[PDB]
Amino acid sequence: GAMGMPNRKYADGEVVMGRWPGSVLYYEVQVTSYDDASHLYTVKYKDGTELALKESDIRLQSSFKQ
Structure with a gap:
């Protein structure tokens, strides 16, 4: 289980x-x-600018997930 x-x-x-x-x-x-x-995720920032980063750079919107 990776969740x-x-x-x-x-x-x-x-x-x-x-x-x-x-x-x-x-x-x-x-x-x-x-x-x-x-395995790179392209994401877009609030600044409009988009970037590519690793999965290891990405975390949940909140680490408190239920």
Whole structure:
């Protein structure tokens, strides 16, 4: 059981928390697309700018999920 596993670790269109690559900070992003070969999720930030990050950079919108 991975818990977060609909096909990928995250869904698409879903709003999650994503770490900024060079930082340890997490910002709020929405997943737009996904590279399945190298396992990269393309997400879009509140700033409009979209970025690709690893699944390990993405966490739930809230870690408190019930």
